[PDB]
Design a protein around this ligand. Structure first.
Ligand SMILES: [Ca+2]
Ligand SMILES: [Ca+2]
Ligand code: NA
Ligand code: NA
Ligand code: NA
Lengths: 247, 241
DNA sequence: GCCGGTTAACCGGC
DNA sequence: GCCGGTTAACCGGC
């Protein structure tokens, strides 16, 4: 991680920060800090895409523009769709998109850190948030394996806890954790919640002992196993209880 | 519907409205049907304010006088017990955006806003599972003449520094053919449609609707389970040993 | 403690 | 046309 060496600082600077009154905008402050302290490495996802295509003005159409990624897995995680990519121009730049994978990209020497900020109202009853689609993650692992891209990118999370203090939201603490250091078989896949893996960053175990390739194979075994169990569970929860009204 | 008879009134007032870059719907209804119209949390406040002698969640839950509406409208037990004139519910995940109620009959209204300049993407309408439980509850308690669940689509496009409403649509969930309802399991098990596309040709009774919906729901759940193997298990087996 | 369902719409494959 | 996956976190049952 490129963030990890300055996380202590980040943690200190963010605590006490405020945003007018839900905590979503704290992500903008995370970005501001990173832009100030790692200016050359830091991008919004759409910003990285805009920069990539701006540097290659002669490369037009979605196919050629896709070739600029030089990585199947990164293309998968970061690109916009074919029409969006084809219609891109300096006058028609990418702006934020609701379901972009990452909030913030940090890249250096062609290694990629995908950072997702998780904001959390710390006064409400704890509810683990959507982290990332378990299915997007499965596809990522399969593509990592097919292409032997095991040392190219990390997926990392920064939790920003906040509380309502008068007119303002204030940050009270933060946490940092790396997806690829968690034990894959311990990740919670909430199928109803858009097939999303869910955890609090603060709680994520970080003791995985294997290679990235091993992480990928292991998560895939986990994913496949959970999907099988869910297929069965749906009869239990969505079929059985209601059959008495229709038979 | 209490809204349907005045839809033309609403469509006209809205069809040129602009917000800065559309709960103008609530405003209009509140001004033209003030005795009937509530935000959900507002209806609950009103209900509990009008019954000051009733405290705690069990007793306040009895104020609904209907298990099904209890299930659709109420907040959780602790929230309800902790409610007071000085601790009022605020807007919230709530089933409905707007409630219109008259003579012990309830219209649940959900407003769907839509950026009409982008590729059409049918929005989450309501949980197929919440709907399933609701039908189940309607049947168990024979509450077939109590409420409707209705939708109002408001289409808009960006124009300058503002969003402009260019059209609207209105449709009643309980007039749609249940078996035509698209359940998108990945998207939080939500029914999905555009209001303007919703068929309104169901001819049977409310009870028939509920039974037909349940058969549909159960059938679609079974299909989803099966399709999970094909999409989430099969394509990944080759990587595991 | 443990568990998982719900709201807001929203992009883009073939 | 037809089809369905993803982001934002968030609430309250035993
Ligand atoms: Ca985020
Ligand atoms: Ca709505
Ligand atoms: Na994001
Ligand atoms: Na995410
Ligand atoms: Na809804």
């Amino acid at each position: 991680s490129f963030i990890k060496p300055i996380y202590q600082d980040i943690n200190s600077i963010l605590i006490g920060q405020k945003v007018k009154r839900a905590g979503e905008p704290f992500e903008k402050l995370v970005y501001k800090f990173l832009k100030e302290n790692l200016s050359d490495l830091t991008f919004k996802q759409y910003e990285y895409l805009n920069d990539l295509f701006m540097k290659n003005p002669a490369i037009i159409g979605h196919e050629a523009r896709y070739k600029l990624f030089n990585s199947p897995t990164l293309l998968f995680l970061l690109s916009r769709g074919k029409a969006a990519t084809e219609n891109w121009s300096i006058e028609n730049l990418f702006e934020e998109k609701q379901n972009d994978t990452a909030d913030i990209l940090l890249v250096k020497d062609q290694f990629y850190e995908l950072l997702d900020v998780k904001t959390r109202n710390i006064s409400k009853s704890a509810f683990a948030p959507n982290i990332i689609s378990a299915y997007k993650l499965a596809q990522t692992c399969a593509k990592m394996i097919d292409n032997k891209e095991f040392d190219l990118f990390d997926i990392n999370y920064l939790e920003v806890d906040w509380e309502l203090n008068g007119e303002d939201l204030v940050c009270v603490s933060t946490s940092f954790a790396e997806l690829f250091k968690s034990e894959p078989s311990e990740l919670y896949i909430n199928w109803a919640a858009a097939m999303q893996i869910q955890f609090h960053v603060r709680d994520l175990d970080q003791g995985f002992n294997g290679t990235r390739e091993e992480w990928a194979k292991s998560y895939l075994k986990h994913f496949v196993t959970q999907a099988e169990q869910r297929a069965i569970s749906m009869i239990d929860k969505f079929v059985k209880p209601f059959k008495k009204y229709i038979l």
